[PDB]
Amino acid sequence: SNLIEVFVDGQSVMVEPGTTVLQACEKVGMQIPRFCYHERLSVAGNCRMCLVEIEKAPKVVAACAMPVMKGWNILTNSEKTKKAREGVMEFLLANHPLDCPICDQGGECDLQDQSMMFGSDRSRFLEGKRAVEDKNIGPLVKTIMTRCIQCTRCIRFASEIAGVDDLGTTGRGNDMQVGTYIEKMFMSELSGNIIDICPVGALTSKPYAFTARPWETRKTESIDVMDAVGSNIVVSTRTGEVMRILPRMHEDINEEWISDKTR
Amino acid sequence: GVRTSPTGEKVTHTGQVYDDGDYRKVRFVGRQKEVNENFAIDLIAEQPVSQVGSRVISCDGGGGALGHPRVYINLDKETKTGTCGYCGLQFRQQH
Amino acid sequence: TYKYVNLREPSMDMKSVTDRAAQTLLWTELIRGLGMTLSYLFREPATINYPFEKGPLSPRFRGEHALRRYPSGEERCIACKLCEAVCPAQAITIEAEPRADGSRRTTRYDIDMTKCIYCGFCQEACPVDAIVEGPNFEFSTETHEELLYNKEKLLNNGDKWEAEIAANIQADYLYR
Amino acid sequence: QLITVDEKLDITTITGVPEEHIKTRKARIFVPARNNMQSGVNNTKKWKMEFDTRERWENPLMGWASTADPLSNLVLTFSTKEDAVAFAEKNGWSYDVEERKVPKPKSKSYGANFSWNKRTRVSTK
Amino acid sequence: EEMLTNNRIWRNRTVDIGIVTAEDALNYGFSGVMLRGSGIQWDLRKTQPYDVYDQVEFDVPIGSRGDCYDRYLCRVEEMRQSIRIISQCLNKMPPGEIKVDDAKVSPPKRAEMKTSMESLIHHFKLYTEGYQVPPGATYTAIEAPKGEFGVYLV
Amino acid sequence: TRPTVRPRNDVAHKQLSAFGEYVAEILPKYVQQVQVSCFNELEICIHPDGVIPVLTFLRDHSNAQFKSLADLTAVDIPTRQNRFEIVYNLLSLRFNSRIRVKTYTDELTPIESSVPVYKAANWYEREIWDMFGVFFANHPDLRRILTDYGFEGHPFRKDFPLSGYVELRYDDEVKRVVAEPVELAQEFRKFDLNSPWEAFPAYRQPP
Amino acid sequence: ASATRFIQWLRNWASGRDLQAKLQLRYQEISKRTQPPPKLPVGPSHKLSNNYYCTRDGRREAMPPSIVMSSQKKAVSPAPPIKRWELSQDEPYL
Amino acid sequence: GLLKKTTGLVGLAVCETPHERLKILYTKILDVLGHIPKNAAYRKYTEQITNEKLSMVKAEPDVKKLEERLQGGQIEEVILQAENELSLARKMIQWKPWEPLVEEPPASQWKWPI
Amino acid sequence: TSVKPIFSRDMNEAKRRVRELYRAWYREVPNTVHLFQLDISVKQGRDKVREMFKKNAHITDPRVVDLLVIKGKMELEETIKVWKQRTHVMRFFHETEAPRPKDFLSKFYVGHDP
Ligand SMILES: CCCCCCCCCCCCCCCCCC(=O)OC[C@H](COP(=O)(O)OCCN)OC(=O)CCCCCCCCCCCCCCCCC
Ligand code: SF4
Ligand code: SF4
Numbered sequence A: 001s002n003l004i005e006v007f008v009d010g011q012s013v014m015v016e017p018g019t020t021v022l023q024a025c026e027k028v029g030m031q032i033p034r035f036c037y038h039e040r041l042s043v044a045g046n047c048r049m050c051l052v053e054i055e056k057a058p059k060v061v062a063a064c065a066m067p068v069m070k071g072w073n074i075l076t077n078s079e080k081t082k083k084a085r086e087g088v089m090e091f092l093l094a095n096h097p098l099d100c101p102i103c104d105q106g107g108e109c110d111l112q113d114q115s116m117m118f119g120s121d122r123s124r125f126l127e128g129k130r131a132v133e134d135k136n137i138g139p140l141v142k143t144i145m146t147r148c149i150q151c152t153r154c155i156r157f158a159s160e161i162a163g164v165d166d167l168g169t170t171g172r173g174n175d176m177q178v179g180t181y182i183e184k185m186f187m188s189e190l191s192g193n194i195i196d197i198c199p200v201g202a203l204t205s206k207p208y209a210f211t212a213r214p215w216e217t218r219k220t221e222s223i224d225v226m227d228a229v230g231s232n233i234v235v236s237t238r239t240g241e242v243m244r245i246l247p248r249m250h251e252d253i254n255e256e257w258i259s260d261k262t263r
Numbered sequence B: 001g002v003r004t005s006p007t008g009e010k011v012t013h014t015g016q017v018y019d020d021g022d023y024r025k026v027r028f029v030g031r032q033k034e035v036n037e038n039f040a041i042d043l044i045a046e047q048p049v050s051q052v053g054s055r056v057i058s059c060d061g062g063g064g065a066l067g068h069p070r071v072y073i074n075l076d077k078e079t080k081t082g083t084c085g086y087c088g089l090q091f092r093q094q095h
Numbered sequence C: 001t002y003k004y005v006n007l008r009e010p011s012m013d014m015k016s017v018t019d020r021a022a023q024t025l026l027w028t029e030l031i032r033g034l035g036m037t038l039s040y041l042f043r044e045p046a047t048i049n050y051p052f053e054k055g056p057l058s059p060r061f062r063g064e065h066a067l068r069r070y071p072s073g074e075e076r077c078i079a080c081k082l083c084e085a086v087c088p089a090q091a092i093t094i095e096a097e098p099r100a101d102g103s104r105r106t107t108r109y110d111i112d113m114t115k116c117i118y119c120g121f122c123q124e125a126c127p128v129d130a131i132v133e134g135p136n137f138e139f140s141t142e143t144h145e146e147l148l149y150n151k152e153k154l155l156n157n158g159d160k161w162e163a164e165i166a167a168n169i170q171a172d173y174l175y176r
Numbered sequence D: 001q002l003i004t005v006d007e008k009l010d011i012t013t014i015t016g017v018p019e020e021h022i023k024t025r026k027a028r029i030f031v032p033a034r035n036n037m038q039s040g041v042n043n044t045k046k047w048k049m050e051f052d053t054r055e056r057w058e059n060p061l062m063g064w065a066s067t068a069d070p071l072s073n074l075v076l077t078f079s080t081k082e083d084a085v086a087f088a089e090k091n092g093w094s095y096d097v098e099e100r101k102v103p104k105p106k107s108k109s110y111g112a113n114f115s116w117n118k119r120t121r122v123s124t125k
Numbered sequence E: 001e002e003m004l005t006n007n008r009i010w011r012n013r014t015v016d017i018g019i020v021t022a023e024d025a026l027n028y029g030f031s032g033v034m035l036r037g038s039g040i041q042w043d044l045r046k047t048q049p050y051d052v053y054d055q056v057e058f059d060v061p062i063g064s065r066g067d068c069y070d071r072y073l074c075r076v077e078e079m080r081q082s083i084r085i086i087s088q089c090l091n092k093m094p095p096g097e098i099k100v101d102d103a104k105v106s107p108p109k110r111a112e113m114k115t116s117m118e119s120l121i122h123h124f125k126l127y128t129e130g131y132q133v134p135p136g137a138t139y140t141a142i143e144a145p146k147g148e149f150g151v152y153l154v
Numbered sequence F: 001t002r003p004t005v006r007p008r009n010d011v012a013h014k015q016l017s018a019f020g021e022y023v024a025e026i027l028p029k030y031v032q033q034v035q036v037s038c039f040n041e042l043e044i045c046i047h048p049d050g051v052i053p054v055l056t057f058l059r060d061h062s063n064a065q066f067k068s069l070a071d072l073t074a075v076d077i078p079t080r081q082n083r084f085e086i087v088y089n090l091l092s093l094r095f096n097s098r099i100r101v102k103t104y105t106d107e108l109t110p111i112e113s114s115v116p117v118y119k120a121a122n123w124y125e126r127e128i129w130d131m132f133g134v135f136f137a138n139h140p141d142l143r144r145i146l147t148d149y150g151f152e153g154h155p156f157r158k159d160f161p162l163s164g165y166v167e168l169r170y171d172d173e174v175k176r177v178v179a180e181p182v183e184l185a186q187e188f189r190k191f192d193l194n195s196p197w198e199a200f201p202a203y204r205q206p207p
Numbered sequence G: 001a002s003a004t005r006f007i008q009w010l011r012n013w014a015s016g017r018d019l020q021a022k023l024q025l026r027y028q029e030i031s032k033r034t035q036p037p038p039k040l041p042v043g044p045s046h047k048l049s050n051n052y053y054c055t056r057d058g059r060r061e062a063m064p065p066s067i068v069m070s071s072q073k074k075a076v077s078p079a080p081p082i083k084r085w086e087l088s089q090d091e092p093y094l
Numbered sequence H: 001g002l003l004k005k006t007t008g009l010v011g012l013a014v015c016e017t018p019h020e021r022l023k024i025l026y027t028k029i030l031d032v033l034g035h036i037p038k039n040a041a042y043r044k045y046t047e048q049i050t051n052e053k054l055s056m057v058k059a060e061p062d063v064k065k066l067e068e069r070l071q072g073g074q075i076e077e078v079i080l081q082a083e084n085e086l087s088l089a090r091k092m093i094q095w096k097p098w099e100p101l102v103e104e105p106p107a108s109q110w111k112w113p114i
Numbered sequence I: 001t002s003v004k005p006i007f008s009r010d011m012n013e014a015k016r017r018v019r020e021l022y023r024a025w026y027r028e029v030p031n032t033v034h035l036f037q038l039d040i041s042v043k044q045g046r047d048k049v050r051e052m053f054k055k056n057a058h059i060t061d062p063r064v065v066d067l068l069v070i071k072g073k074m075e076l077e078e079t080i081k082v083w084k085q086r087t088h089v090m091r092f093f094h095e096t097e098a099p100r101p102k103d104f105l106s107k108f109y110v111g112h113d114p
């Protein structure tokens, strides 16, 4: 009854009021590019990778945050949308370090993959890059903060999901730095999940460091026995060896998180 | 430095050495254990630390296009040195 | 356009006919063929005097593999595993971990030289020029097991051949 | 002229598979879970069939991972669950079907970050 | 040719040996010199040109008896035409790049890969995952030296 | 004329589309689908009963004259009820054109042998039987062609393992080559290469 | 190249050619084995402006096949008849 | 025009009386097509292209000029094609492919990719 | 449930083809042992033939039976024409296989395979 009508590339779709442009695209099987947006975190709207053209609107909107209005035609593949993605990806990679061979994220990196699928194929940045100092937040999460793209997923997860207010940004402008400011360890029981939600290799697992690459792991979907919650997990193995433990999405149990002990 | 275990078998730079009672060392009987004696961990520690003037320095490993991808190293932490993640050279901000 | 390789009608004048009768009976075209091999008998043969003389190669030659170093003596390989992923023959096997100083380095680097197709993809994929195919082609062995290289063997190959490897890379890297 | 055949399709006797790897195998029919390291969902579209993991041991010469399982790397792709189940029946494999997991729809509100009186008010941006 | 072409022993071993009619060659699936030996005027470099074959001049040898000797003469004359083409390629070689300037397919230069973030990402991805190819199926063929060589690629 | 993009040839696309509907008009009994690809390749998809009538028409009809069978192969698609797609690639020297004809079958259903239309098909159909197990009816001499004598299974099926089920060696005791269950000193390493991000929107499948 | 004049004459007469002009052994007419460095050109897409990838993306202009007929006026041929080849003027008869 | 000595194709004999042979074969094709229903596209299309070829033969008494007009290679190739067409027309009567589609394919039989 | 037959329209027709194949295999064994100079007896070979026929005695699809007979006939043709070697003929007897115990305990001791 309350459902309004919108269009994705001219295809009609019925959505509830308050649905975002990103969620309307989800219905027809389109996945808008993203970095800051996470469906289990509060909306941020800062990476600007989800910019999409609305037909007849001169300005692209941030799909992750903009609520759809009745009758909108979202153009997910327009020349305007495609140029917005290339421009934003260009800004993301301008100061990003050439770390992929030594970066544990390589091969399962959303920055690599969305650069392949939505960015340009070359650079025109001719300057020196930003370099940021690293920060210790305990024995579980290694931080290479030069790789951070300031998506603020970790900050939002810690505040909303883990209920811990230690992470935040300091400074402003290009020198805005995600961290704790003071020397502090982020030692929650849910801390290890910030590795998963960080789209880049800025936050990675210290125990897992350097040991494998994503393509070569075999994925075994199993269950955790560290407690009685029954968290669903993926056991990554390679050549007969357990390499790491990853969450497996189950809406009715662990959603997409696992405890540190489980991890 | 290459070490010899109490069984006399050389220890590799990866720490591998058949323990006493491992039949697999019979493969070396009448032959030899191929061991590289230029331990890279030792060689890189002999390099002097390079003092620089800026807060950020870049390393491509030397030789331009014959080195490694160019990276940038922050030198704000004065307790430790900035190390190149590719080649292991160390850098220090002079005062 | 096209041409006919065999569509010529021979002339039937008594001179041409008599010329062919002489060819049939006096074997003139078979004698002519003997002239050609006689001429070769008095040509200098093309044989080189191996192993004292070698055949010519180029700086791009794809031979035995070796793991290289930086001038300091540090290994170039950072266990990125790009070579292992691209290897068409799955001839490369790698394991890695943080070194005692935190460096990202391999603890296993095997090349099964009886799987390898000497295609050079691994040295194209390497971003730091760690794994190369050197110029050596004279390393035949008496056992199969001697052709299963581990990291110690490949590092020794790098130290053994680095003087030549560096000079060949210097001559060809501007084409890459 | 068509004939009336009235039995379930069984091709086990004409597939050439050894008896061991029909009766002793357990096939899993499932849609792969999303790799949690990435947000892309394009690897959760198709159904997969995999077989139970068997022993891998270390090669004495080199320490490589040896196997005696001819099906260790066999993975099949299907459009639908029914297509995968139909394939498993005619080949005579015992199978387990896991239902597809679709993310539950969420209600997202940017304006909720600045609530006047609710706990959704964020302390930082 | 001074050893074979006019040699009566060679001609005795090849002339009227393995004759194949033009219609049989087609219906049996023959191609290349196995067609042209029998007189079928057909050469994929002329009729379905690829790369820059439309920009070189060469003749297609054609047989008249469909036997071993004619196929021998066709192959020898094809070698002469190859030299003729090679002379044109040497003279008309243009400058420029050697692989498509599109780093989502062809890898970047090593110097670029070690300097540019985009180049490193694309180099990394091309040598691990490789480039994705749009869904489809093609049968593509060339005039290989032995005949029509093609791939049906899905 | 952008340097890196393959040029599009529309005169051929129209010509192939015209001939495609020409074939469908003449053989409605068997033709199920006709399509032309963006690189200008015409494909006719037919009912398997029409293999001989369709191929004979294409070989003999004055406006077709597809005298040469370039290739005859099969593709295994396990998700389909009829898993085996049979593909005929034909060449017309007269009209300097190519056409692809496709049909389907399953494990237990035969296909009429096209040898009477093209003698080239004799070995192609032996290869399809050997590698996929698709039986061809009234074939002059159907039997394995590529696999070893006594080999069991059809290797090019997607559910046949890459390394097979058995392997050979010489056993000194019995003084002959023997076959034994396959064991590998190093297991083939499966790689998961697919990116989780869609690459080609134009081919997106509706949900 | 070191053969004497008599032997040069003899193998020339026996072969019926002037073998010396086109020796099959290479001497110093070949390129030097040490060459100067190249400086290779760059491609058309090496521009700093007017170079958006979405205007030069071949893979994304590929489209699914056009369905002409799906079972879900003059006669035509697949293409115009091939022209008859003309004989070579370079050398029509070998 | 003087009669050829060779057609250039191995096994394809030179025809002494091409015009008459073509008229015989084209007439036979038209006779065979009379037994196919008037609505069959095979009949309408084959009759049309046949009548155009026959009209050329009746209007061009020179074998060289006629070959140029027919665009089917040597006139002996054209005779062979006429014979092949006549063979097809007889077969089509048994097959009757003008009938409606025998069977629809399964739902996703031709869907690609999966 | 109406499908195209391969040869036999029903099980009774298929079974006749099976017995025709079995007779051919039964008659051929003495020649195979003689021609290949096998050390087995004619009884051992004929027992093996029975064993290969007995393992497929539970089939009730006439099409599956027809394919088995088709593969059996091809299998016999290779033997008669000596396309097979002795190694191929003796692969039916698995002479170098160490017997694999089939009880729970013996399996339990040797490994994890069920
Ligand atoms: C006053 C009255 C006088 C009366 C007497 C007058 C007689 C004079 C005229 C007599 C004729 C002279 C020739 C006699 C020699 C024999 C000629 C001969 O037999 O040649 C024909 C033979 C077959 O050739 P073919 O063309 O294939 O067959 C005919 C086609 N239906 O061709 C062949 O034999 C082919 C041989 C192939 C093998 C050749 C390999 C060796 C060639 C090099 C040897 C050179 C000669 C060496 C002689 C050594 C002497 C010590
Ligand atoms: S985060 Fe991604 S793009 Fe950045 S260095 Fe790591 S793998 Fe490369
Ligand atoms: S550390 Fe990772 S999750 Fe946190 S803001 Fe940076 S990129 Fe985002």
Ligand code: SF4
Pocket (backbone or CB within 6 Å): C083, C086, C087, C088, C089, C090, C091, C092, C111, C115, C116, C117, C118, C119, C120, C121, C122, C123, C133
């Ligand atoms: S040369 Fe080719 S096959 Fe050999 S190790 Fe390198 S990538 Fe693998």
Ligand code: SF4
Pocket (backbone or CB within 6 Å): A101, C076, C077, C078, C079, C080, C081, C082, C083, C084, C094, C122, C125, C126, C127, C128, C129, C130, C131
């Ligand atoms: S040799 Fe090169 S490509 Fe291979 S793992 Fe080491 S750094 Fe990576």
Ligand code: FES
Pocket (backbone or CB within 6 Å): A033, A034, A035, A036, A037, A044, A045, A046, A047, A048, A049, A050, A051, A062, A063, A064, A065
């Ligand atoms: S996903 Fe919308 S701005 Fe980040």
Ligand SMILES: [K+]
Pocket (backbone or CB within 6 Å): A105, A194, A195, A196, A197, A198, A199, A200, A201, A202, A203, A204
């Ligand atoms: K991460």
Ligand SMILES: [Zn+2]
Pocket (backbone or CB within 6 Å): B059, B060, B061, B068, B084, B085, B086, B087, B088, B089
């Ligand atoms: Zn460095």
